[PDB]
Amino acid sequence: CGLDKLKEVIPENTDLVTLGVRKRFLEHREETITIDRACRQETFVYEMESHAIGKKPENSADMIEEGELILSVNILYPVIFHKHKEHKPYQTMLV
DNA sequence: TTAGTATATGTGCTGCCGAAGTTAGCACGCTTTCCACAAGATATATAAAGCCAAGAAATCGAAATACTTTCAAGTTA
Protein backbone atom coordinates (compact mmCIF):
# COMPACT_ATOMS: atom_id res chain seq x y z
CA CYS A 1 0.00 0.00 0.00
CA GLY A 2 2.31 2.68 -1.35
CA LEU A 3 2.22 5.54 -3.84
CA ASP A 4 5.37 4.64 -5.80
CA LYS A 5 3.30 1.85 -7.43
CA LEU A 6 0.40 4.12 -8.43
CA LYS A 7 -0.46 5.80 -11.73
CA GLU A 8 -0.36 14.65 -15.00
CA VAL A 9 -0.51 11.85 -17.58
CA ILE A 10 -3.47 11.88 -19.98
CA PRO A 11 -6.09 9.36 -18.77
CA GLU A 12 -6.33 7.21 -21.91
CA ASN A 13 -4.97 4.04 -23.53
CA THR A 14 -6.98 1.79 -21.19
CA ASP A 15 -10.33 0.01 -21.41
CA LEU A 16 -12.58 2.19 -19.23
CA VAL A 17 -16.20 3.31 -18.92
CA THR A 18 -16.30 6.65 -17.10
CA LEU A 19 -13.43 7.94 -19.23
CA GLY A 20 -15.83 8.20 -22.17
CA VAL A 21 -18.08 10.52 -20.17
CA ARG A 22 -14.97 12.38 -19.04
CA LYS A 23 -13.84 12.97 -22.62
CA ARG A 24 -17.36 14.00 -23.64
CA PHE A 25 -17.36 16.55 -20.80
CA LEU A 26 -13.91 17.79 -21.85
CA GLU A 27 -15.20 18.31 -25.40
CA HIS A 28 -18.35 20.06 -24.18
CA ARG A 29 -16.07 22.31 -22.12
CA GLU A 30 -13.72 23.11 -25.00
CA GLU A 31 -16.84 23.99 -27.02
CA THR A 32 -18.10 26.94 -24.96
CA ILE A 33 -16.49 27.09 -21.50
CA THR A 34 -13.41 29.27 -21.88
CA ILE A 35 -10.72 28.88 -19.22
CA ASP A 36 -11.43 27.89 -15.60
CA ARG A 37 -14.24 30.21 -14.52
CA ALA A 38 -18.01 30.78 -14.37
CA CYS A 39 -17.94 28.50 -11.30
CA ARG A 40 -19.44 31.02 -8.88
CA GLN A 41 -21.29 28.66 -6.53
CA GLU A 42 -18.41 26.19 -6.78
CA THR A 43 -15.84 28.70 -5.56
CA PHE A 44 -18.34 29.85 -2.93
CA VAL A 45 -18.61 26.33 -1.52
CA TYR A 46 -14.83 25.90 -1.76
CA GLU A 47 -14.07 29.03 0.25
CA MET A 48 -16.86 28.48 2.78
CA GLU A 49 -15.47 24.98 3.42
CA SER A 50 -11.86 26.18 3.62
CA HIS A 51 -12.81 28.89 6.13
CA ALA A 52 -13.14 26.10 8.73
CA ILE A 53 -9.92 24.16 7.98
CA GLY A 54 -7.48 24.13 10.89
CA LYS A 55 -8.40 27.49 12.42
CA LYS A 56 -7.26 27.81 16.03
CA PRO A 57 -9.11 29.79 18.73
CA GLU A 58 -7.79 33.05 20.10
CA ASN A 59 -8.01 31.77 23.69
CA SER A 60 -6.85 28.38 24.93
CA ALA A 61 -10.13 27.88 26.81
CA ASP A 62 -12.15 28.01 23.56
CA MET A 63 -10.77 24.73 22.17
CA ILE A 64 -13.60 22.43 21.13
CA GLU A 65 -13.43 19.17 23.06
CA GLU A 66 -13.26 15.89 21.16
CA GLY A 67 -16.57 14.31 20.20
CA GLU A 68 -18.69 17.48 20.14
CA LEU A 69 -21.91 17.13 18.16
CA ILE A 70 -22.03 19.12 14.91
CA LEU A 71 -25.49 19.45 13.34
CA SER A 72 -26.20 20.70 9.82
CA VAL A 73 -29.49 22.60 9.57
CA ASN A 74 -30.96 24.00 6.36
CA ILE A 75 -33.39 26.92 6.62
CA LEU A 76 -36.17 28.03 4.28
CA TYR A 77 -37.33 31.52 5.25
CA PRO A 78 -37.97 33.35 1.96
CA VAL A 79 -40.42 33.02 -0.92
CA ILE A 80 -38.33 35.03 -3.42
CA PHE A 81 -36.56 32.32 -5.42
CA HIS A 82 -37.06 29.48 -7.86
CA LYS A 83 -39.95 27.40 -6.89
CA HIS A 84 -39.12 25.59 -10.16
CA LYS A 85 -35.43 24.74 -9.69
CA GLU A 86 -35.89 21.74 -7.38
CA HIS A 87 -35.90 24.24 -4.50
CA LYS A 88 -32.70 26.03 -3.42
CA PRO A 89 -34.18 28.93 -1.37
CA TYR A 90 -31.87 29.70 1.55
CA GLN A 91 -28.77 29.30 3.72
CA THR A 92 -27.55 26.27 5.69
CA MET A 93 -25.92 26.46 9.14
CA LEU A 94 -23.72 24.34 11.40
CA VAL A 95 -24.39 24.26 15.15
C1' DT B 1 -119.51 -20.34 110.09
C1' DT B 2 -116.31 -16.36 109.54
C1' DA B 3 -112.05 -13.65 108.41
C1' DG B 4 -108.48 -13.39 104.67
C1' DT B 5 -107.73 -13.20 99.72
C1' DA B 6 -108.21 -12.93 94.59
C1' DT B 7 -110.97 -10.94 90.75
C1' DA B 8 -113.46 -8.12 87.89
C1' DT B 9 -116.61 -4.31 88.19
C1' DG B 10 -117.59 -0.29 86.42
C1' DT B 11 -115.38 3.87 87.19
C1' DG B 12 -112.39 7.50 87.05
C1' DC B 13 -108.38 9.00 86.51
C1' DT B 14 -104.18 10.72 83.02
C1' DG B 15 -102.22 12.21 79.04
C1' DC B 16 -102.51 11.98 73.98
C1' DC B 17 -101.60 13.83 70.47
C1' DG B 18 -104.37 15.71 67.33
C1' DA B 19 -108.95 18.44 65.39
C1' DA B 20 -111.47 21.46 63.97
C1' DG B 21 -111.29 24.97 63.57
C1' DT B 22 -110.14 29.92 64.16
C1' DT B 23 -107.29 35.08 63.04
C1' DA B 24 -110.10 42.50 61.43
C1' DG B 25 -111.14 46.78 56.88
C1' DC B 26 -111.37 48.26 50.25
C1' DA B 27 -109.43 48.24 44.72
C1' DC B 28 -106.94 45.76 41.64
C1' DG B 29 -106.68 41.20 39.71
C1' DC B 30 -99.97 -1.20 29.15
C1' DT B 31 -100.74 -6.42 27.53
C1' DT B 32 -102.63 -10.62 25.24
C1' DT B 33 -105.12 -12.44 21.23
C1' DC B 34 -108.72 -12.58 19.00
C1' DC B 35 -110.66 -11.64 15.19
C1' DA B 36 -112.76 -10.60 10.91
C1' DC B 37 -113.06 -7.25 7.61
C1' DA B 38 -111.26 -5.42 4.09
C1' DA B 39 -106.80 -3.97 2.17
C1' DG B 40 -101.14 -5.71 0.24
C1' DA B 41 -99.80 -7.66 -3.89
C1' DT B 42 -100.32 -8.92 -7.50
C1' DA B 43 -100.40 -8.80 -14.67
C1' DT B 44 -101.07 -4.16 -18.19
C1' DA B 45 -100.90 0.48 -22.18
C1' DT B 46 -99.88 4.46 -21.53
C1' DA B 47 -98.90 8.65 -23.65
C1' DA B 48 -95.83 12.15 -20.60
C1' DA B 49 -91.40 14.41 -18.15
C1' DG B 50 -88.18 14.52 -14.02
C1' DC B 51 -85.13 11.95 -11.42
C1' DC B 52 -80.87 8.89 -9.79
C1' DA B 53 -77.15 6.05 -10.67
C1' DA B 54 -72.91 3.51 -14.43
C1' DG B 55 -70.01 4.78 -18.72
C1' DA B 56 -67.69 7.63 -22.44
C1' DA B 57 -65.75 12.19 -23.98
C1' DA B 58 -64.01 16.89 -22.67
C1' DT B 59 -61.84 20.16 -20.94
C1' DC B 60 -59.58 22.45 -16.78
C1' DG B 61 -55.23 22.42 -13.79
C1' DA B 62 -50.82 22.24 -13.71
C1' DA B 63 -46.25 20.00 -13.83
C1' DA B 64 -41.80 19.05 -16.22
C1' DT B 65 -39.26 20.74 -20.16
C1' DA B 66 -38.03 24.22 -24.27
C1' DC B 67 -37.33 29.68 -25.55
C1' DT B 68 -35.98 34.09 -24.50
C1' DT B 69 -33.79 37.68 -21.03
C1' DT B 70 -30.44 38.77 -18.26
C1' DC B 71 -27.01 39.75 -16.03
C1' DA B 72 -22.06 39.22 -14.88
C1' DA B 73 -17.41 38.16 -16.09
C1' DG B 74 -14.57 38.00 -19.72
C1' DT B 75 -12.80 38.85 -24.42
C1' DT B 76 -10.54 41.73 -29.30
C1' DA B 77 -9.51 46.44 -29.28
Distance A84 CA to B55 C1' (A): 38
Q: Please name the nucleotide lying closest to A34, CA to C1'.
A: B74
Q: Residue A71's closest CA among A90, A94, A91?
A: A94
Provide the 8-state DSSP code for A36.
Answer: S
Task: Give CA–CA dist A7/A20, Å, rounded.
Answer: 19
> In this structure, which long-range contacts are made by residues A86-95, counting pairs with CB atoms below 8 Å and at least 24 apart in sequence?
A94/A70, A95/A70, A95/A71
Q: What angle do CA A71, A73, A78 make, to 5 degrees?
A: 165
Q: Give this entry's resolution in angstroms.
A: 3.0
Q: Which nucleotide in the DNA or RNA is closest to residue A37, CA to C1'? A: B73
Cα separation values, A95 from A64, A71, A75, A92, Å: 12, 5, 13, 10
Experimental technique, in short, is cryo-EM
**Calpha distance A28→A44 (Å, rounded):** 23
Nucleotides of B under 7 A from a protein CB: 64-66, 73-75
What single DSSP character describes residue A61? G
Please note each residue after which chain A is broken, C-to-N distance over 2.5 A, or write none. 7
